[PDB]
Amino acid sequence: AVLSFHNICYRVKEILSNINGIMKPGLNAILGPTGGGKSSLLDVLAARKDPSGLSGDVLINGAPRPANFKCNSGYVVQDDVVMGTLTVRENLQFSAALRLATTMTNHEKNERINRVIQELGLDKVADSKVGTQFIRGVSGGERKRTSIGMELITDPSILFLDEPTTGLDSSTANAVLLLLKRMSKQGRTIIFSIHQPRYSIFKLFDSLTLLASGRLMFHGPAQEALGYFESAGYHCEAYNNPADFFLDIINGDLIEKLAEIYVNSSFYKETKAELHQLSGTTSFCHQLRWVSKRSFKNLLGNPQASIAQIIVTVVLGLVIGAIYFGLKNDSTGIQNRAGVLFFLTTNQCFSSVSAVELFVVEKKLFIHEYISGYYRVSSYFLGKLLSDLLPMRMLPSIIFTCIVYFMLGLKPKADAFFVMMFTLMMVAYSASSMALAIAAGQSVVSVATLLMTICFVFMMIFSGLLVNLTTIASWLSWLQYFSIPRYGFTALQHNEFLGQNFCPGLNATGNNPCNYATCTGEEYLVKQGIDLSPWGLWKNHVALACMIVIFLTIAYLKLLFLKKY
Amino acid sequence: AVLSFHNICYRVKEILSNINGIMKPGLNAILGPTGGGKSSLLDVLAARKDPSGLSGDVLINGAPRPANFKCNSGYVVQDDVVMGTLTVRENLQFSAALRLATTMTNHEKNERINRVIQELGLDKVADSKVGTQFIRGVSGGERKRTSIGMELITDPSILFLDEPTTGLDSSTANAVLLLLKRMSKQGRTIIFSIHQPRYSIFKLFDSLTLLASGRLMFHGPAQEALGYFESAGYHCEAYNNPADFFLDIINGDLIEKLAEIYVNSSFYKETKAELHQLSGTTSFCHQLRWVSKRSFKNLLGNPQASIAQIIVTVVLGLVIGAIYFGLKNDSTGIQNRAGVLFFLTTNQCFSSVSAVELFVVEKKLFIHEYISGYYRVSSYFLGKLLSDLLPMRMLPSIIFTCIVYFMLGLKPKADAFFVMMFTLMMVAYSASSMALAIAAGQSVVSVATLLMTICFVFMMIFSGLLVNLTTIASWLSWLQYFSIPRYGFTALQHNEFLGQNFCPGLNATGNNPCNYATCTGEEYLVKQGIDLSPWGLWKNHVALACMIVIFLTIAYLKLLFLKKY
Ligand SMILES: Cc1ccc(NC(=O)c2ccc(CN3CCN(C)CC3)cc2)cc1Nc1nccc(-c2cccnc2)n1
Ligand SMILES: CC(C)CCC[C@@H](C)[C@H]1CC[C@H]2[C@@H]3CC=C4C[C@@H](O)CC[C@]4(C)[C@H]3CC[C@]12C
Ligand SMILES: CC(C)CCC[C@@H](C)[C@H]1CC[C@H]2[C@@H]3CC=C4C[C@@H](O)CC[C@]4(C)[C@H]3CC[C@]12C
């Protein structure tokens, strides 16, 4: 194929202006400083910029662009979207399992990818972890071509690369481009935007589209690539870089002085002729099965934050298991259970600040994938929390009630012990479902951690311990239902002080003199304003279920309405 | 003033090796890549590297370095050390007020610095805020020139500049380079290390000392600056950068091939001739008066970290003031009073995370000023907390207990109001001192926060409310004394349960049947196990003062034993 664009303009102040470059198959390039449009019109061609400010017409061999054009062409980006704790043969496995595996069977995807790993120089390191900045692995010179093949699995026709060789250890930074030379001969239109090449590839190109000050510059066809500026007064000369002086008139030795050449130039007079010549979603249930495989294999591969909520949980169980040990039934038994039941509820809230890193640590990965048509939004959101949020906020609840229960000496039944295990694994979801809502769809975390714990302290006040709720008169008992650690703390106190006594040496079973005593259980709950009825126990657990579905929806309601551009 | 160094070696693996350069008065330079040794030998000549790993010698006009060599030579650095929210005239005033003017009075410093601001291009914007990243102001081309004049006040001999043009908006990047030429004509030996110049001032220098791979490289003299590489095979050619092709040898068109030409070059053999020829704390009381004037001015002009700790104090005072309001003396008066006293002492303890930014955010400021001999460490530390710690930890305490005391209805005495205002501003310093102890002398905040709020939860348990302390049996009750909000909570509970009744309609002054009642005040305190005597109240305050003196001391001790190099 062949790309072209005529009379392109754009606004957010008008950013770009009328440019009319052509783009033949081969190996193109975009040049210029960072302030110009070296990173702008790449997002115009690949349907990445917003179609509001776009005015001109961009063509693909005379025909206009299809309605599915962005999901057939690669967009290898600068910041690497390859997953860290994953195998390379597993990483290309994930790309092949979504874009093209609708009809071909499971021994047809593995022969197409072996055609790719036999390219790229990859068969030596084909079964290693790619490594992160935190864990050593495959070096940075070999991960950029690893991300190239992830969008080469489907058969493309344009590879919109996005400045590969920046911060890429220049001794082997050419190894990406000499690789790009040999793959360009098969009929691929490599269109990218390199960042400050010195001299070496200035002959090893096919067509430049240098831009400066975000306005306009040609030199579309370029193998001579320098002859346009040696007749304009401002000459690049002996002992001068050719690729740096061209934009040095804004660097201080006007750009309008070299802009005005193109009314009477040597390349504009032929390109307007051709540009005026030609002027006239699959298998939903397969998705969240395979999306579930990455986030689970990511957790096993990185055992530094996974065990970090297991050790600090079972250590904290033993400290509460050692401070409290054999709590008695004396006069200091009401206060001794009011604390240890308050600590288990509040720790299940405040240790759920670490769910902000479930969506915001890889927000750059998500927007690139959904715009490339891998999976639907609801398949990501129903699959992500089903794989990481559930089995990391459930097992650190049942270990944290199995250790503590037979060390304190609570009510030693069988059904009343499976409720305390149930309420902690329900309040920890309804605490984490709050953190998922005010985080998803952002870029930083230091405005969604100072905001969340400043709202988790206003929930800690109305909790039936520091207030004694049935004393605020009218206009501040309607904030009482908005606090998550209430409903866990009430249901934990309901099955705890039923049928117990705290006045040993006397008896008040049915003969109760001497008021202002609080020595039996069932009068203590009356004073704290909670119902003495078996419906009143399960009233909280149907409230947290409605607190989860409300909060989890407005996460998924805001993952749809985000700027996917 | 003339520098000379012969056969320098340096080990942390030896990074550096034998270098043989001579530095003439004029305007020198240091070139090369960032991974090499351009940023390494600047800290060797300017006495910033430690003299341990150094084996070679440096000479100032044949004499070695005196014991006071770093206290006459400025070290203008690449990241700015100018105070952001301060005016330029007072900023250069502070630089003059410490180094030289102990004998002259206050009408000689402005006589010298008016000559300085008449240079430098300062006479337009001499009286504004210089600004920072977060708050705007004077542009970057004027902020870097302010640091130059800041260490130009005392009459120097060498200005060891430290890569000025890093990220410095190239159209006026030559302006500071043009400014350095004119001041150098009067006996200023400028030694700096530029970062990738294009072509222009490469000829407008006096003596390069280009280096690469941290090993060695020559061209000491520089007036032709290119005549060496046209005789070495790897010739810099027409239409090629001369500034890069000298160091493009690290990219591979071998660096060591050029080093073998250095045993037979035209500059190795005559430089060894001369180097083998020539080889054969003031007014301490005045200091902390003036140091406190800066940081107090840094609170006035920056109303984003000062009034932010007043609004969240007074919007919290009403929320506490409205939840509890007119607390009674009936049977739910104990729990309703122990809550709000627990929430006041812990809120002063978790409001200590906002004081670890008091030393950490300006460590790069403190290291540069102490090695240049501005002030002693005991003047900086004792001058810091007098200005930024005292009037910002006390004023959000007495506004927090005045607005709530009559709002709740506590004991309406006169002296019992001056204990609650006193104890909260006594627990606040001891809380802020502990956050000063495990932060002072570090680089990142996110280690001294997840280590400190993991310790201020081990103090929130042993706090007289969630434990009922006389049940921890033997071997964890020795951990009872290591917790800061215990001492603030007991002394607040001591003067608030003394002399009241929580048993309306009955009376237990000397007639108390019906045990487990807690109808009087003094039965509640003995049930918690605190001393019911005027010694036990003031026992906590003398314990808190011993906590302050211990923690403030190790803040001062770990400031001394720091790697100031
Ligand atoms: C078990 C508990 C009970 C109460 C509290 N918090 C408070 O008692 C409290 C009091 C006042 C404020 C208000 N603060 C005022 C100033 N502004 C700026 C911020 C909020 C906040 C919290 C924390 C905890 N525990 C807790 N909190 C956070 C984290 C952890 C934790 C535990 C284990 C592993 N990792 C983290 N544990
Ligand atoms: C703004 C959003 C996030 C918070 C929504 C709070 C609401 C939805 C929560 C707080 C209190 C909860 C209610 C408390 C009482 C009951 C019991 C029963 O009669 C129906 C459910 C119902 C009515 C709960 C439904 C969910 C509930 C109404
Ligand atoms: C490193 C620090 C925090 C712990 C060291 C202990 C210091 C800080 C604290 C902990 C317990 C405190 C002691 C507890 C008991 C008393 C009461 C009286 O007899 C004199 C003060 C004295 C003796 C306190 C002095 C300060 C003290 C010793």
Residue A252 touches partner B, C-beta closer than 8 Å: yes
Same domain, B431 and B534: yes
Nearest CA of chain B to the CA of A270: how many Å? 29
Single-letter amino acid, residue B485: P
- B32/B37 Cα distance (integer angstroms): 7
Here the tokens at position A149 are: 């093949």
Closest CA of chain A from B196, distance in Å = 12
Count: domains in chain A: 3
The answer, for B311 touching chain A at a CB cutoff of 8 Å, is no
Closest ligand 2 atom to the C-alpha of A546? 26
Partner residue opposite A323 with nearest CB, options B170, B242, B472: B472
| Residue type, position A253, single letter | D
Same domain, A68 and A90: no
Q: Are residues B288 and B273 in the same domain?
A: no
d(CA B369, CA B375): 8
Which chain B residues contact residue A226 at CB under 8 A? 239
**Cβ neighbours of B473 in A, within 8 Å:** 325
Q: Are residues A273 and A142 in the same domain?
A: no
Residue A283 lies in a domain: no
Residue B317 is assigned to a ligand binding site: no
Chain B: residue nearest A520 by CA? Answer: B516
The count of CB pairs under 8 A between chains A and B is 119
Q: Whose CA is nearest to atom 22 of ligand 3?
A: B543
User: Quick check: is A505 in a domain?
Assistant: no
Distance A457 CA to ligand 2 centre (A): 20
Q: Does A167 touch chain B (CB under 8 A)?
A: no
Host H or E run for residue B460: helix B458-461
Distances from the Cα of A468 to the Cα of A304, A473, A490, B502, angstroms: 42, 12, 12, 15
| B134 and A CB contact within 8 Å | no
Q: Give a yes or no: residue A120 inside a domain.
A: yes
Write the DSSP string, A66-128. Answer: PSS-GGGSB---SS--S-SSSBHHHHHHHHHHHHSTTSS-TTTHHHHHHHHHTTTT-TTSTTS
B276 and B290 share one domain = no
Domain-embedded: residue B508: no
3-state secondary structure of A23: strand
Task: Look up residue B464 and give its amino acid.
Answer: G
Give the number of residues written for chain A.
Answer: 565
Residues across chain B:
565
Q: Does B241 touch chain A (CB under 8 A)?
A: yes
CB-based contact (8 Å) between B507 and chain A? no
Same domain flag for B301 and B165: no
Whether A285 is in a domain gets the answer no
Query: B554 phi and psi, to 5 degrees?
Result: -70, -20
Q: Which of A140, A155, A170 is the last residue of a domain?
A: A155
Phi then psi dihedrals of residue B27, to 5 deg:
-150, 100
Element (DSSP H or E) covering residue A26: strand A26-27
Kindly list the distances between the CA atom of residue A533 and the CA atoms of A358, A512, A537, A539, B471, in Å, as whole numbers in the listed order. Answer: 39, 21, 7, 10, 33
- d(CA B229, CA A324) in angstroms, rounded, equals 79
Q: Which residues line ligand 1 (CB under 6 A)?
A: A 312, 343, 346-347, 350-351, 454, 457; B 346-347, 350-351, 453, 457, 460
* Whole-angstrom distance, CA of residue B149 vs CA of residue B123: 13
Token digits for A259? 């802009």
State the Cα torsion B186-B189-B195-B199 to the nearest 10°. Answer: 50
| Structure-block tokens of residue A185 | 């001969």
Map B313-372 to HEC letters: HHHHHHHHHHHCCCCCCCCCCCHHHHHHHHHHHHHHHHCCHHHCCCCHHHHHHHHHHHHC
Nominal resolution in Å? Answer: 4.0
Determined by which method? Answer: cryo-EM
Q: Does A369 touch chain B (CB under 8 A)?
A: no
Contact B129, B138 (CB under 8 A): yes
Task: State the Cα–Cα distance between residues B141 and B168, nearest whole angstrom.
Answer: 7
Q: What Cα–Cα distance (Å) separates residue A194 from each residue in A34, A163, A319?
A: 11, 5, 57
Enumerate residues 6+ apart whose C-beta is below 8 A from B88.
B117, B122, B125, B126, B127, B128, B130, B146
- Nearest to residue A14, comparing CAs of A214, A211, A212? A214
For residue A448, the one-letter residue type is A
Q: Would you say B529 and B469 are in contact if contact means Cβ atoms under 8 Å apart?
A: yes
B140 is in an annotated binding site: yes
Please indicate whether, in this complex, the C-beta atoms of B343 and A467 are within 8 angstroms of each other. Answer: no
Q: Of B155, B181, B204, which residue is a domain's last? A: B155
Answer yes or no: do A240 and A107 share one domain. no
**DSSP β-bridge partners for residue A310:** none
Mutate to test the interface with B, among A313, A332, A351, A404 (most CBs of B within 10 A): A332
Residue A59, helix vs strand vs coil:
strand
SS3 A246: coil
Record: contact A461-B241, CB cut-off 8 A: no
Instruction: Residue B477: give the domain boundaries.
Output: 284-503+515-560
Residue A62 and residue A96 in one domain: no
Neighbours of B30 (CB within 10 A): 24
| CATH number of the domain enclosing A27 | 3.40.50.300
C-alpha B425/C-alpha B508 separation (Å) is 36
Instruction: Tell me the β-bridge partners of A8.
Output: A19
Backbone angles phi, psi at B289, to 5 degrees: -65, -35
Q: What is the dihedral of CA A534, A540, A546, A550, to 10 degrees?
A: 170
Same domain, yes or no: A236 and A107: no
Q: In whole angstroms, what is the distance from residue A232 CA to residue A300 CA?
A: 63
Tell me whether residue B251 is in a domain.
yes
Yes or no, beta carbons of B170 and A513 under 8 Å apart: no
Does the residue B565 lie in any domain?
Answer: no
Asked if the structure places residue B510 within a domain, the reply is no
CA distance B220 to chain A (A): 21
Whether residue A34 lies within 8 A of chain B, CB to CB, comes out as no
Handedness of CA A312, A313, A314, A317 (dihedral sign): positive
- B94 and B62 share one domain: no
Residue nearest to atom 16 of ligand 2 (CA): A543
Instruction: For the beta carbon of residue B560, count every other beta carbon within 10 angstroms.
Output: 11
Distance between CA atoms of A119 and B362, rounded to whole angstroms?
51
Nearest by CB to residue B238, choosing from A238, A250, A327, is: A238
In chain A, residues preceding a discontinuity (C to N beyond 2.5 A) are 12, 253, 280
Q: Quick one: tokens of A173?
A: 């930074």
Whether residues A145 and A203 fall in one domain = no
Residue B396 CB partners (closer than 8 Å, separation 6+): B309, B310, B313, B351
Answer yes or no: do A272 and A333 share one domain.
no
Which of B113, B140, B155 is the last residue in one of the domains? B155
A-interface mutation test, from B241, B334, B477, most A Cβ less than 10 A away: B241
Q: Which ligand is nearest to the CA of A531?
A: 2
